[PDB]
Amino acid sequence: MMKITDVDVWVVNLPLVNPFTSSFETKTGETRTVVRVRTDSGVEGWGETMWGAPVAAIVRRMAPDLIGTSPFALEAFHRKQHMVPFFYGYLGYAAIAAVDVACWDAMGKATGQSVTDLLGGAVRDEVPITALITRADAPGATPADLPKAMAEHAVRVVEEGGFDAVKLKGTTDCAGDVAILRAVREALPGVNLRVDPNAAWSVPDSVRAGIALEELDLEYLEDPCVGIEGMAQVKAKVRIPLCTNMCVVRFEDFAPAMRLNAVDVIHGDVYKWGGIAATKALAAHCETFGLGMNLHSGGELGIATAAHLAVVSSTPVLSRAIDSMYYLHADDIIEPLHLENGRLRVPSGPGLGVSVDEDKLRHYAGVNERDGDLTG
Amino acid sequence: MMKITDVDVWVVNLPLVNPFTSSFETKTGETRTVVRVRTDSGVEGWGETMWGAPVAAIVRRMAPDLIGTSPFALEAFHRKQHMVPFFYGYLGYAAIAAVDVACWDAMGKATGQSVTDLLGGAVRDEVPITALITRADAPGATPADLPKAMAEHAVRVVEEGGFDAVKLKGTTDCAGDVAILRAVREALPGVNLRVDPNAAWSVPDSVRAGIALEELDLEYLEDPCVGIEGMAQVKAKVRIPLCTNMCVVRFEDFAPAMRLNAVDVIHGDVYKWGGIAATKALAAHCETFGLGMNLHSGGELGIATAAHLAVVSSTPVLSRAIDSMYYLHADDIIEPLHLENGRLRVPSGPGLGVSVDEDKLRHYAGVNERDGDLTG
Amino acid sequence: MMKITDVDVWVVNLPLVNPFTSSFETKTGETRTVVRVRTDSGVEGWGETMWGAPVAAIVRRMAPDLIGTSPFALEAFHRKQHMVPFFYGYLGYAAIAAVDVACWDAMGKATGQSVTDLLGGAVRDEVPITALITRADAPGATPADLPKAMAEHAVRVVEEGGFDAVKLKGTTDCAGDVAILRAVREALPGVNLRVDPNAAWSVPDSVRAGIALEELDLEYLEDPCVGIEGMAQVKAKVRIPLCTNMCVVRFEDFAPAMRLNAVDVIHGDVYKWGGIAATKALAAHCETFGLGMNLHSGGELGIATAAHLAVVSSTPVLSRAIDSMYYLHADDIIEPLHLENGRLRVPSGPGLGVSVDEDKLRHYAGVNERDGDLTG
Amino acid sequence: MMKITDVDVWVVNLPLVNPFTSSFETKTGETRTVVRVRTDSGVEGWGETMWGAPVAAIVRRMAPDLIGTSPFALEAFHRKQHMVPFFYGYLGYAAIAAVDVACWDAMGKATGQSVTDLLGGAVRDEVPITALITRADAPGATPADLPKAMAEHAVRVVEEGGFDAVKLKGTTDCAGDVAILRAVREALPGVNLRVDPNAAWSVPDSVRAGIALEELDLEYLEDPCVGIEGMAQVKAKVRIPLCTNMCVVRFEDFAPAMRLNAVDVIHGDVYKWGGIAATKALAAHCETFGLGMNLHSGGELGIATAAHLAVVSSTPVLSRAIDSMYYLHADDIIEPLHLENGRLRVPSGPGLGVSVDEDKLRHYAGVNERDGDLTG
């Protein structure tokens, strides 16, 4: 009969090993929000979600009403907070997800079960991850030299890391993106290969590039352009599976995207969709419509990755190499997850199966206090 | 670390209070299949599903491979048995559901939690049920007298029982069905009213009847005709929400039914859909597509009803008066559920929250052994 | 004025020559249900259908009401049993088909006519069959060696057997399936070539594989993925005729599959569709919608094959090499059908044109009694 | 082993009792083509089809190649004559149907079975027919008086004849047609009521009239306008089941009519569709698409009506009162069918179950020879 007694929130800054360039920005660290839910039985559940001050602010506003409730009562919590994402958008889903994850952790600890086992049990014990490559990996390169430099980098990363998949972060320079992919495919004929321009290409440029890229047999083309309408126009012309984490980001988007035939693959992400049950539900929706599914990464540290691992472990349709920034981090706030030969081991043991280093938590919260958010 | 040690299966015959007439048959009892899953920790999980000998046979064939597995490992179990419904159809889903429910019961008992709490926790504590009326309730009646006799019966049942909804079992006599509904609505202007011909009407007759029935503001018209195509033609013409438990009975049916705009409301049913997680998933699918959802009854006794109650208790979209044959039964194989003023109380306590009377189980299994199945 | 006096049912186990691997299982024998319908004129009609104990059980439950009816009264029989497939699924259609076939046999014998002549008469006298190849035909092979081993096997089977068509049983390993087909096509440039993954591939993998397979000019791609929705997505992208025996398996599926443009070719199968008239009707539906048609094999012995031969003989649209496990059987329960140069001769003479060896029937029923079903 | 030895053809003129007015013409007799197929076993099969000289001419051209063939070989015959309807249109189907029917008669006689029993056996023994009313039934009437005169006529016909359905032959005067139907419905509140303008109304007038007619709950509106496009526009706006025997008259029309949602009910007619098997196939197509089905009448005498009766008797979906000019004829060329209380008794006995009066045949062929065709 657990009742929540405390909800505490921190914001942390953690460092990457090397810079990371999307079409959007170039980052050198993660800012994350960490939540601990305490109960009257002494159980402590931990959650973690994307971004800093504004996400923490939402969690702290939801907290007073969480006091005295059961961590098992997630349906009631989500319904109570139904309007939060309407106003706060992605940050609203993210804030709700932190609480959601912390409650699953607490539920597992209270019952002596892994979150994986509360989600249907394991169908796999290891989760392959994806090598993320960006133009920041070829700092010196001239436009003429960029494709070769990127391909040589990709080969090193795959050979050293054992990655099953490689994903290029695309840019506004779509012709250059295509040139890079051609060189990477030539160097790695057998690797699953993706490109993600983060919606930076126009629809006509996405069609022209997509046609050019057909010969490379990409696993998918991820968000070439903005919007359900544009994505559907691309899917109508281009014979490459089309993936999104930008035009379908909530259930309200799903029926319209299906009727308009906008996508072939959807990325789940607990922090984007507001919780673990939502992500299991999304998996079922993908199976019903014959869609592929993968997981998107928003810069998860160990707590948030452990939640995603529980989801992948227990979800048949998540059979691909997921996106994960985890291997690119220089430190964590839990004892490190097991990463070997390009796959993460699913934690075992009660809850998320992680142990939080509260000294590192305190330290990196201090770093954030002095340095400010790296996000936002 | 529960491991299953035994799977035992019985088939029972239980009596109704009065006969029950669908367009399909007239019944005076239920035949059900009961499953107990035993573990090495001493925990015993109970499930119950529809029909007799052929469903029991499927469960017994799945049983040997269940030995040594965890009741938490439901994703693996469902995937292992994925082909069973392709060959065995509804009976295959039903057999899988019995095992599924027994595992949820065992999971709750092992963790000291209600199934309701393992499904997201309660959002409601009571579940309204529906008064089911059939032509067997007006045994003596001439065609001219039938509508009045049915209306007078409906009034008595609603006034005595406190039911929020009334459902007429329709027949091949669609003109007579309409006459009955007109009389019932006149007598009960405020009750939620439904008719279910169990697909016995042709599409043109469904359109003609549907048009006639618009003036009665039915909660829904349930399966007037056969098939996604026919149902979609009815929905295109008739301004009454259209419900099914016959043209969408598995996830493979769902995408086509949406693209063809076949239905407005879908009935879930754990035993028809093969398990509890499938039913929670169906609820999410209904929310995504703006569909109503209710629960169908296939003649559940106490164990199977308790499972449905856990689902309704924890599922916002199940906000309607469900169908339930439970109130029409003359006995049960558990200590009776609480039924008061037309609503069932959600059980509390570990697992399904029921206690099985093994003497009644043994007795009614003997009744089945001597009398044979009443179903099939 | 024949009236049925007896309906007797056996279940038999019969051996294959070599193992047979689908994406689903690996088999070494068939289990079948055999039905004899006796009349008051002394005429005996024989039917045969798929699977064992559960199909036999359905037939035996339908039997008492068959007593005293005419074998000609098939419309009435099918309507009486209309609900059987709703509950019993594929097994329900199968059980009905056994009775259906036995009645056609009895009708032919009573009238001195072949079933072929009662179905519109012959338009062809020979029926080409298909060489079925599976990975079990390359037992020793490494992944690198598998395509060559499969191609060499295919060449031997085609050269020795005179087969017009070759069908690869596909697997979850879709990349390996494609490699095998490439090698087979290279070795046999002129053969009609098919692959059937039995719905084991995801939709994105089906699109990727389908694109790759276009260069091989396959006769069709059969059930790459699950469901009408997925199949329609494949047909929208992949320029290979798409065939099914899994997403359209009854008339209720047909209108939705047409509106959603899901398939180009449909497999008929008397045992899957519940009878001979249903299969003739399906042929007409295929002609109306410009679909190809072939026949699926569920492991027919001589009685069931003879029924399929009567259908093919009398049905213009069945102009392809059918699937037939018949040539892979080590024995039969009738005097063997004529198989020469990759085609089966249509039987002549009254009814199905077969003579049942009742000693073999008794023997193989005993084998089943002691060994149990190989199916289910 | 029947082989056809002779095909003989006559054209006959037979009288009606009273004139019959469609939107198209006013008739006082039928002209029909009669065919006898003789075999080497002495069996004689009889067929009958619509119209005279030009239909007889087609049959006589097909005849020489029929010599030496089996009456059972209908699939081969239809395929051989596949191009005949492309050039000769309705008359081509009609000529083929005469031969088709004669072969079914011969098949039944050769096997000692009714045609009904060769078509799946009886599901009903009686066939209700429809009272056909036209403006010729109110000869004296002023426009102001016409509706009352028509209603009084309808009442007399229904009360005297026991008809379950009444069908008004519509005209170019759509406002007058509506006025008549209003008066008829007022006088006969319980009768199934239809109107058939034989495509004489424009689409806008069909929409205006259809809207006006909704209040009368017609069984169907039959061919208000020309063409699949127009019919679909009517169905989109008007809430009355829409029936045709003019925009879907062959299988090539069926898929387009379904995709465009043109009709709710299709009339079969053996003579329009070229044979009995085609009509059974059409029934199955209607069931698959949830369409109603009825039979159209082109002026059948006893032989042709007997064929239609065999079809209705054996076909579940033909559950309506059929159209039949039979009751309006002053004589026949067989011993009269049993008509009592508005329903025709299905013949029993071998073949079509009719006995041809060859003296009447000879007489009415002479009448045609001297008087000429009344059709064409």
CATH number at D303 reads 3.20.20.120
The answer to whether residue A265 neighbours chain C at the CB level (below 8 Å) is: yes
Write out the E strands in chain B.
Answer: 4-21, 26-39, 44-50, 126-128, 130-133, 165-169, 192-196, 220-222, 242-244, 265-268, 292-295, 339-340, 343-345
User: Which residue does chain C place closest to D253, by CA atoms?
Assistant: C288
Q: Which helix (H) or strand (E) holds A192?
A: strand A192-196
Query: Nearest CA to CA, how far is D299 from chain C (Å)?
Result: 27
The answer to whether residue C202 neighbours chain A at the CB level (below 8 Å) is: yes
Q: How many domains does chain B have?
A: 2
- Residue A173: which residues within 8 A CB-CB, separation 6 or more? none
Out of B204, B212, B226, the one facing D264 most closely (by C-beta) is B204
My answer on whether A108 and A2 are in the same domain is yes
B neighbours by CB contacts (3+ pairs under 8 Å): A, C, D
User: Which residue does chain C place closest to D122, by CA atoms?
Assistant: C73
Amino acid, res. B202: S
Domain of A32, CATH number, reads 3.30.390.10
B255 chain-C contacts, CB cut-off 8 A: 227-229
The answer to whether residue B102 neighbours chain D at the CB level (below 8 Å) is: no
Q: Which helix (H) or strand (E) holds A302?
A: helix A302-313
CA distances from A161 to A149, A155, A340 (A): 18, 10, 8
Q: What DSSP line would sit under B277-343, residue for residue?
A: HHHHHHHHHHHHTT-EEEE--S---HHHHHHHHHHHHT-TT--SPBP-SGGGBS--SBSPP-EETTE
Instruction: Tell me the three state secondary structure of residue C326.
Output: helix
Out of D123, D277, D288, the one facing C120 most closely (by C-beta) is D277
- Residue C36: which residues within 8 A CB-CB, separation 6 or more? C6, C7, C8, C44, C45, C46, C47, C102, C356
The answer to whether the CB of C177 falls within 8 A of the CB of C208 is no
Place of tokens 């044109």: C353
User: Which residue does chain D place closest to B230, by CA atoms?
Assistant: D290
My answer on whether A331 and A372 are in the same domain is no
Please tell me the number of Cα atoms within 13 Å of A300 on its side-chain side.
27
Out of B89, B227, B256, the one facing C260 most closely (by C-beta) is B256
The alpha helices in D112-217, defined as continuous H runs, are 115-118, 146-161, 174-187, 203-213
Sheet with A26-39, strands from edge to edge, namely A4-21, A26-39, A44-50
The answer to whether the CB of A262 falls within 8 A of the CB of A237 is no
- Burial pattern D329-351, b for ≥16 Cβ within 10 A else e, equals beebbbeebebeebbbebbeebb
Size of interface C-D (CB pairs under 8 A): 91
Instruction: Tell me the three state secondary structure of residue C26.
Output: strand
Tell me how far apart the alpha carbons of residues D306 and D48 are, in angstroms, rounded to a whole number: 10
Q: Report the DSSP pairing between strands A192-196 and A220-222.
A: parallel
The alpha helices in A260-299, defined as continuous H runs, are 270-273, 276-288
Amino acid, res. B253: D
Out of C54, C83, C227, the one facing B54 most closely (by C-beta) is C54
* Reported resolution, Å: 1.6
As given in the structure block, the two tokens for residue A87 are 């106003």
CA distances from C285 to B45, B227, C116 (A): 49, 17, 20
Nearest Cα to D320, choosing from D210, D167, D121?
D167
The answer to whether the CB of D313 falls within 8 A of the CB of D93 is no
Q: Which residues pair with C129 in a beta bridge?
A: C322
Q: How far apart are the first and last CA of chain A?
A: 39
The answer to whether the CB of D156 falls within 8 A of the CB of D349 is no
Instruction: State the residue range of the domain holding C97.
Output: 1-112+354-376
User: Which residue does chain B place closest to C245, by CA atoms?
Assistant: B86
What crossing angle do the helices spanning C251-259 and C227-237 adopt, rounded to 10°? 40
- Other CB atoms within 10 Å distance of the CB of residue D246: 19
C neighbours by CB contacts (3+ pairs under 8 Å): A, B, D
A81 chain-B contacts, CB cut-off 8 A: none
Tell me how far apart the alpha carbons of residues B50 and C189 are, in angstroms, rounded to a whole number: 53
Indicate yes or no: CB of D255 within 8 angstroms of CB of C285. no
Catalytic residue of the set C167, C285, C296, C308: C296
Query: Nearest CA to CA, how far is C257 from chain A (Å)?
Result: 15
As given in the structure block, the two tokens for residue C205 are 């993998």
CA distances from B200 to B197, B231, C62 (A): 5, 12, 22
The answer to whether the CB of C14 falls within 8 A of the CB of C330 is yes
Q: Do chains A and D touch (3 or more CB pairs under 8 A)?
A: no
D217 chain-B contacts, CB cut-off 8 A: 208, 211-212
The answer to whether the CB of A169 falls within 8 A of the CB of A199 is no
The answer to whether residue A369 neighbours chain C at the CB level (below 8 Å) is: no
Q: Do chains D and C touch (3 or more CB pairs under 8 A)?
A: yes
Indicate yes or no: CB of D290 within 8 angstroms of CB of B229. yes
Q: Do chains D and B touch (3 or more CB pairs under 8 A)?
A: yes
Disruptive mutation site among C172, C178, C203, C214 for chain A (greatest number of A CBs within 10 Å):
C203
Tell me how far apart the alpha carbons of residues A274 and A277 are, in angstroms, rounded to a whole number: 9
My answer on whether D348 and D358 are in the same domain is no
My answer on whether D346 and D288 are in the same domain is yes
My answer on whether B163 and B240 are in the same domain is yes
CB within 8 Å of chain B, chain D residues 271-300: 288-292
Q: Report the DSSP pairing between strands B292-295 and A4-21.
A: unpaired
Q: Exposed (0-12), middle (13-18) or buried (19+): which is B50, by Cβ within 10 Å? A: buried
The answer to whether residue C117 neighbours chain D at the CB level (below 8 Å) is: yes
My answer on whether D332 and D220 are in the same domain is yes
Angle, alpha carbons C280-C51-C130 (nearest 5°): 55
The answer to whether the CB of C283 falls within 8 A of the CB of C268 is yes
My answer on whether C103 and C151 are in the same domain is no
Query: Nearest CA to CA, how far is C94 from chain D (Å)?
Result: 19
User: Which residue does chain A place closest to B115, by CA atoms?
Assistant: A72
The answer to whether the CB of B111 falls within 8 A of the CB of B2 is no
Query: Nearest CA to CA, how far is A199 from chain C (Å)?
Result: 21
Indicate yes or no: CB of D217 within 8 angstroms of CB of B204. no
Query: Nearest CA to CA, how far is D17 from chain C (Å)?
Result: 37
Indicate yes or no: CB of C70 within 8 angstroms of CB of D117. yes
DSSP, res C188: -
A257 chain-B contacts, CB cut-off 8 A: none
Indicate yes or no: CB of A292 within 8 angstroms of CB of C204. yes
The answer to whether residue B258 neighbours chain C at the CB level (below 8 Å) is: no
Query: Nearest CA to CA, how far is B319 from chain D (Å)?
Result: 32
Indicate yes or no: CB of A118 within 8 angstroms of CB of B290. no
C255 chain-D contacts, CB cut-off 8 A: 258, 288-290
Catalytic residue of the set C27, C169, C272, C329: C169
The answer to whether residue D220 neighbours chain B at the CB level (below 8 Å) is: yes
Indicate yes or no: CB of B229 within 8 angstroms of CB of C57. no
My answer on whether D88 and D119 are in the same domain is no
C227 chain-A contacts, CB cut-off 8 A: 290
Indicate yes or no: CB of C203 within 8 angstroms of CB of A290. yes
My answer on whether B343 and B331 are in the same domain is yes
User: Which residue does chain C place closest to A190, by CA atoms?
Assistant: C175
Tell me how far apart the alpha carbons of residues B176 and B169 are, in angstroms, rounded to a whole number: 12
My answer on whether B232 and B341 are in the same domain is yes
My answer on whether B219 and B363 are in the same domain is no
Out of B203, B227, B237, the one facing D239 most closely (by C-beta) is B237
The answer to whether the CB of A258 falls within 8 A of the CB of A240 is no
DSSP, res A337: P
My answer on whether A138 and A11 are in the same domain is no
CA Rg value for chain A: 20
As given in the structure block, the two tokens for residue C307 are 């029924």
